[PDB]
Amino acid sequence: AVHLKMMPEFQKSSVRIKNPTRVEEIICGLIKGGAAKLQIITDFNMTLSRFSYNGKRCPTCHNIIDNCKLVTDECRRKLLQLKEQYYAIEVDPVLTVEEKFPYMVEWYTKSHGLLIEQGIPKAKLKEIVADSDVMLKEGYENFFGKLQQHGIPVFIFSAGIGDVLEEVIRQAGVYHSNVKVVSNFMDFDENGVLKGFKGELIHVFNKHDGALKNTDYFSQLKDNSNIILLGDSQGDLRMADGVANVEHILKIGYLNDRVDELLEKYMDSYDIVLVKEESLEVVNSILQKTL
Ligand SMILES: Nc1ccn([C@@H]2O[C@H](COP(=O)(O)O)[C@@H](O)[C@H]2O)c(=O)n1
Numbered sequence: 001a002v003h004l005k006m007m008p009e010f011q012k013s014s015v016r017i018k019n020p021t022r023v024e025e026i027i028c029g030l031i032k033g034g035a036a037k038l039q040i041i042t043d044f045n046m047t048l049s050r051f052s053y054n055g056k057r058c059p060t061c062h063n064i065i066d067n068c069k070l071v072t073d074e075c076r077r078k079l080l081q082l083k084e085q086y087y088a089i090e091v092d093p094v095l096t097v098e099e100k101f102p103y104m105v106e107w108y109t110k111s112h113g114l115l116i117e118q119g120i121p122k123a124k125l126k127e128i129v130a131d132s133d134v135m136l137k138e139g140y141e142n143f144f145g146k147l148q149q150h151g152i153p154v155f156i157f158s159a160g161i162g163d164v165l166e167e168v169i170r171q172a173g174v175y176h177s178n179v180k181v182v183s184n185f186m187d188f189d190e191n192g193v194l195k196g197f198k199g200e201l202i203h204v205f206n207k208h209d210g211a212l213k214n215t216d217y218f219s220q221l222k223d224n225s226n227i228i229l230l231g232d233s234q235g236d237l238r239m240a241d242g243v244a245n246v247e248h249i250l251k252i253g254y255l256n257d258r259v260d261e262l263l264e265k266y267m268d269s270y271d272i273v274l275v276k277e278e279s280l281e282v283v284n285s286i287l288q289k290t291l
């Protein structure tokens with residue numbers, strides 16, 4: 001049997017679990033299925049990457065571009081101001097998802113407009129990422145390493161910028177063959193210069209959509225009926241909506257901001273809530289028991 005009381009990673013003050021006996025049962029289910037039945041569905045920004053480090057806020061994939069040498073200071077100022085205004089709406093505890101939705105569309109349209117005007121070259125993304133302040137969560141090597149060792153499908157579903165994300169994990173040497181990325185990918189002109197974004201916009205509150213547009217991926221993993229889902233937003237709860245068959249699903253949520261106002265809602269919707277936590281130690285311990 002699984003006993004959370006016997007696992008010290010589960011007793012750390014950052015770990016908030018509303019239903020410990022249900023979390024035990026789910027983890028027991030994952031262990032029973034082992035590698036053969038497991039798949040991962042995870043968010044990127046502030047879920048696999050850090051929210052802050054040494055008392056400083058860390059960048060999202062968009063922020064990497066916002067802050068880089070290939071954007072003018074005037075543009076960066078506009079982008080900072082958009083970030084201030086619209087992040088405040090994104091995390092606002094008083095608004096509903098449906099109230100936030102149009103403002104998120106609008107943030108993305110305005111910010112992507114401004115990035116396209118700057119003409120970001122594809123060939124420069126490597127240096128831009130190498131010079132950024134992006135940081136992955138503590139334990140990321142063992143997370144991606146254990147998963148690849150056992151061939152576990154990992155679906156990274158991000159409303160950020162796909163080219164940036166891929167370059168972060170590529171440089172960190174964890175972009176292994178088991179990793180699939182779905183995000184907003186840049187569209188480049190004949191010069192290799194940013195001219196737009198491909199496909200349909202993925203934003204904070206429409207991941208349900210993209211989840212269903214990936215049923216080919218999910219239909220090939222019908223046997224992978226045990227799901228670990230990681231996110232930091234309420235909008236990440238929908239990332240598993242396209243899975244073919246769900247037998248056991250564990251939802252782990254990183255609560256990084258407005259903690260007192262959001263704790264109850266996060267504890268009601270995620271099986272495990274990780275409060276101001278910059279490591280993957282909890283999920284890594286579950287993997288250790290499972291694989
Ligand atoms: N222009 C933008 C648009 C979104 N974002 C951030 O990117 C995040 C989406 O990426 P994830 O889905 O990977 O978390 C949003 O939660 C938002 O805070 C940003 O930092 N700048």
Ligand SMILES: [Mg+2]
Pocket residue numbers: 043044045046047231232233
């Ligand atoms: Mg996120």
